[PDB]
Amino acid sequence: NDTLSYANILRARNKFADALALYEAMLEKDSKNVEAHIGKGICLQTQNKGNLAFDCFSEAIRLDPHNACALTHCGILHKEEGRLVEAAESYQKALMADASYKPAAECLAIVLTDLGTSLKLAGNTQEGIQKYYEALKIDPHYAPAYYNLGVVYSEMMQYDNALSCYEKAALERPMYAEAYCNMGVIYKNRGDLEMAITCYERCLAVSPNFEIAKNNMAIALTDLGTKVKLEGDVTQGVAYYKKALYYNWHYADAMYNLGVAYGEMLKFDMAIVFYELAFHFNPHCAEACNNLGVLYKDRDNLDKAVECYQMALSIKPNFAQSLNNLGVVYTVQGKMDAAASMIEKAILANPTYAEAFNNLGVLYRDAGNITMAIDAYEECLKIDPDSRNAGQNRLLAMNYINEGLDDKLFEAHRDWGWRFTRLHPQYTSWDNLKDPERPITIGYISPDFFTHSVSYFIEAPLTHHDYTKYKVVVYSAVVKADAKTYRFRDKVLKKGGVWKDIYGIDEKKIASMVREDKIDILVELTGHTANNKLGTMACRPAPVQVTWIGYPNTTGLPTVDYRITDSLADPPDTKQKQVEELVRLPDCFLCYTPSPEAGPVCPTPALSNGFVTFGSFNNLAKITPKVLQVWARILCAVPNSRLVVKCKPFCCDSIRQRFLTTLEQLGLESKRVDLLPLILFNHDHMQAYSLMDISLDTFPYAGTTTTCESLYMGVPCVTMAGSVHAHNVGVSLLTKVGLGHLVAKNEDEYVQLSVDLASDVTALSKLRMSLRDLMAGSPVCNGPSFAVGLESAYRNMWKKYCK
Amino acid sequence: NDTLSYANILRARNKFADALALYEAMLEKDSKNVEAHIGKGICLQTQNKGNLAFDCFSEAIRLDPHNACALTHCGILHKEEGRLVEAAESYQKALMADASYKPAAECLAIVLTDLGTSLKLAGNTQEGIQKYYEALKIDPHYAPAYYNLGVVYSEMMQYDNALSCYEKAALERPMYAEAYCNMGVIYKNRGDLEMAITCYERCLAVSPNFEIAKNNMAIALTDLGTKVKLEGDVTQGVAYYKKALYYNWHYADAMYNLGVAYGEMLKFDMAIVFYELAFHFNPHCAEACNNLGVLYKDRDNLDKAVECYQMALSIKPNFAQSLNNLGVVYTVQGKMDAAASMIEKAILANPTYAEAFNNLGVLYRDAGNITMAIDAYEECLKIDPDSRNAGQNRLLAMNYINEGLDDKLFEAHRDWGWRFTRLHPQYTSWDNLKDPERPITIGYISPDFFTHSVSYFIEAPLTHHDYTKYKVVVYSAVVKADAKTYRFRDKVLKKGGVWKDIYGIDEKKIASMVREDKIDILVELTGHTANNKLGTMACRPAPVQVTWIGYPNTTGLPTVDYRITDSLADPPDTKQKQVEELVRLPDCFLCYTPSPEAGPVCPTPALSNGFVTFGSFNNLAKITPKVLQVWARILCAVPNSRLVVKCKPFCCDSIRQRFLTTLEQLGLESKRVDLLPLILFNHDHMQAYSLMDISLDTFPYAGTTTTCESLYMGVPCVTMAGSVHAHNVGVSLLTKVGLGHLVAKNEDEYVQLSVDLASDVTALSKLRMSLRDLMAGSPVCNGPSFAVGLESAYRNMWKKYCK
Hints:
Chains A, B: One of its GO terms (molecular function) is protein N-acetylglucosaminyltransferase activity. Chains A, B: Its EC number is 2.4.1.255, 2.4.1.221. The structure is a homodimer. Chain A is α/β, with parallel strands linked by helices. Among the domains of chain A are: 2-155, Serine Threonine Protein Phosphatase 5, Tetratricopeptide repeat; 175-249, Tetratricopeptide repeat domain (Serine Threonine Protein Phosphatase 5, Tetratricopeptide repeat, Alpha Horseshoe), CATH 1.25.40.10; 436-585, Rossmann fold (3-Layer(aba) Sandwich); 605-781, Rossmann fold (3-Layer(aba) Sandwich). Helices cover 60% and strands 7% of the residues of chain A. In chain A, strand 11, helix 33 (705-712) and strand 12 form a beta-alpha-beta unit. In chain A, helix 5 (68-80) runs antiparallel to helix 6 (84-97), helix 11 (177-189) packs parallel to helix 13 and helix 14 runs antiparallel to helix 15 (252-265).
């Protein structure tokens, strides 16, 4: 008995060779020793001598058929070769011999699970399920059987059974990472993400390098961060995206969403970096390219923005947003035909993209197609009735061709103001001490303090302003400053005014700023044009609100008290109703300050070139078909005449061709018309007036700055009187320069005046050489008289408010 | 005269065909019209009819040889074909005709610069330079000539001339981006980075898509961020790295340095992400892999850390830091031979890497090579005399083989404490009200509150503590908690103690925490072992400072007042000097709390196996060669005996083989010794005591917890008395269990006692079955008596401090 026990101890100490030799020496003495046969079989198994182990166990079973141990080891040997059926039978025999032999029960549950899996992969799922239940009847603890049951239930969309099976599997084996992973995947599939996250956390606590769980954790965390961001907590969303990038460092979607979140935070450099990284890891992320193009466009890197949009469209050709943004950039670049084609494709891709309709209307307005622009604006308001940009661009466009014949323009503006007031709260009390004989704070607010038409007039008061009585505050919304902006700032400061840069600010806070500065009269210089601050004007921050030159009609805002004009642009008997009270200055409402780059007046080209040249440097939006027909009538009335028209959209060949067609259809030879694009130079723009002899003013929207520049170069400008301020601005200037005999009341006398002026080249030449001195001695250049008049008007308005 | 002028106007209007036809009709009338010849030549040039233009200009020159215009256009035609010499000659002729003809001068400066460039590329740099100076004599404004001059000067390392040339080039052309770029590159090369940055900013303002300037801006910004970080402002450095990543989104070095900066900020998730991204964009960034491995190691992801270090070493095989870190990880993994090889390679790569020497000493200590460990520690102190870890590991290692024979161990500890006090400030005043008969606040501070040897003793007071008089505060520095930590917390809280988790905190702030809690007696349980808080003890936060079990010798800190012991471990006449005052408890200084997993005592294996089994479960560091020789003497003295030794390092085959060699050299058959590695189970570790009959205690470092566990399983433990506490701990336990007849004073009686115990298997078996009851009735398990004794000692110490 000591030898068998010693051999068993040796076997248990992995000293298989000496124990084997002892079992051999015992079997030489007793070939019927079943236990020695079992020990021999086990020791041969450990030497990978399967056949001889099988022989030893077969002989043991022959000696003791009810040896559950020998039958179990025979089943194990059968199992290792994958011959599962005989092994299963052997285990069944072992249980019949000793139903308490736990190792046989456990191994039988294993092999029964393998059998069930084999049938499952063969599509025999239901009988496999029954054998898995048999396994759990044999060993209610074999967790892998629960895992397999959960997988099967998850394949038949029976998620509740799958969860119950995975929960049982995790109970029997707490470190069964795959069960937690599959639970997390199912819970993610059910919409609940916190549970899924918890399951993945359990998986990674059990298996920290299980990649599938890391990837799914990053996905679930990104979805959760997106939800939480949509719920308002953007910072916690960002935290979730960063934690997601911890498990999946290349998850491009988390980078894209970080880009978006940082964009909303105004951390544009990070938004750019993250969007570009998202594109690097996911090149099919056309949204990243689109948003990157947007950020580059707002950084004024238009070429990069174009590249980004072209990439987005090469990935998603129908990506309506990229189409619209590319159209907008081409509009900025002046590629009008490409802009049109892009915007039209965006509209085709999404007929409810209101902003695309607004941009189309803007493009048509710039192209002079006022009617189509209005139609597009009407479609936009049909889609977005609160589209502020569409409404204001609509009003502006209607100002170019709406001749005073009814109360529709006024109605539209008035209604516009009513709606905004019902949608924009304002103040009702002011702490400004009501003293009529004290200093007054004047705010001038405008986005165009650079080389713009408005600047050529606001320069006059800025230069001629009695600072000892009227403290000046400037609210510059300029997008891009320049030498003229700096000159204005220096002029205001050198006297004692206040300059505030307000580009990129809110509106209500600007109204607060106006209140802290105790502005008494706030003067808006923009009206319904781009980047206006009419919302600040709606807040009523100042006790007196004025408009003056940015818009040639009523603002329609009931909160604006007064509009400054004179008795020539708006005669006392004008029938055009306006929301503002008209205050008429005694002289011209305009004071032109010439550019110090105007250069000399040249002699009249007609003396040297032998031809009369009419011209117009107005935008195409002012060149209405009526004006086109009138100019054709003039040029037919003046034998051998030439017309020079310079407009930015003539950079596009299609626009030139269409304009030529229009003219030719009126009987005018295209060879007689020279269409020049914009030349980006103040000096050269002014010198271009040497190319024309007679300026033709536009109607019903006259020139304003263009007429003044024309006159400064000695080019007579024929205008027409009419029923709207925009028409009579030319009347005011020509009359105050002393050319009131050149203001027509209608088209026929306008033709007659143009032919008469063209008929006396000598009178034309003397006028050319006299016009600079005539204007410089006139009120249009009399800065001091204009300043005293404006100052008096301001004082009068203050007095009106005081009572 | 009107026809020529009209043709010139037509040419100026790009109506080249009609003007050409008019010039032809004029030349039919006057073939000598030089101006008509020039106009024809120009119009043919615009149709790319070079040969016919050349004919027209040649005839013009024949008609007017001094026509500077015709000569200039001939030079232009020559220039377009690249036949620069004749063109230059033609321009020289034009200047001789009319030295004021500016277009000829400008074009001549251009062609002279091209000639200079041609000579430069041919290596004829100096004559090219003279022609560039000729160009500047012709046109002092031709900026490209200045640029070329700057390039040439930059090629001859004449940087001041290069800067002057580039500055002149930028003056003549403000939008010459390349000049600013080259200036920035030179300034970067001179060390000044702000100027370079300014130049690149100018370049990108002129050319926002010039890639070279973006890349160089990112480089310069990364260098500047690195400097500023090294200057203390890490946040501004991070801002610079982010701005760098704005211009170069894939600059891997900025990502690596961001990883480092965020690591110093403790934003490890970001440090990981950035280091991995840096590796993605620069796979040769072995430093990123190293630091990523460090972060994964500190996140307990040892397999990933190993992968990262293997990657770093595949990139940089001699990267000493990665070698050291991989060695440390293998030490944690127990791969002792791989750790040794790695640390030795790190030492070979950098012989001044003190930390590598410390880690080598730690490895040798774990391998039991105390002498080599001490040598390595001495080398580390030679390199880093303030290396806290090396000094403490040295003292600990010396405790294993330094037998009390001189005052060197005490001297080393005492000096250690002196130096730290001179390098660690502490407090001198306490607000604790000096009342000897009031409640006392006891702090227990320790990192090992988990399943560790120390826990088996600290459990006793935590269970048996009168909370109504001694408020308990626990400072747990546990790195990884467990069920025993939670059990201790629950036990302390259920009574009214305070539990504070302090893992990962500073030392001085802990001293502040001890002061706010008004701790009266702070008890350190760690001494010079890993992660101790001896620096907190140096701060003297509590009025009374005690050590008790973490270290078997003096701490050497003069700020520690008392060490708790008894009269058996440190007899009253002990000659070992210590900095602490010894307070001897009346009973055993140890109270073992058995594990509730100890299971039953088995019968003595000798009755069933037929062999006597000696054993030892002590670490190899305690198994000194002297002990090895003694055990060999015992086993030779006991015929047919077996030794079982279980130690963790026996997982390494080389350590087993070397140990076997040692034994065999002493005449012991290796077959008689079973070396078992660590089994990671408390139950199975305790049940392993069924494999041995007699425990052999180690010297001069006795077992402590191992001896108690042995006794609880009924295994007698023979110990020896000696001159040091660590030796006499076994004496204390055996005497207090009632086995004082088994405490030897020397090796010969130790052998005699071991043979006598082995000779009576029957007495051995009765002892085995009695030992549990003997100890349970003994003071070692008498929690109440031990608690009253400790409580009395605490009260006495408080009273001593009160006076």
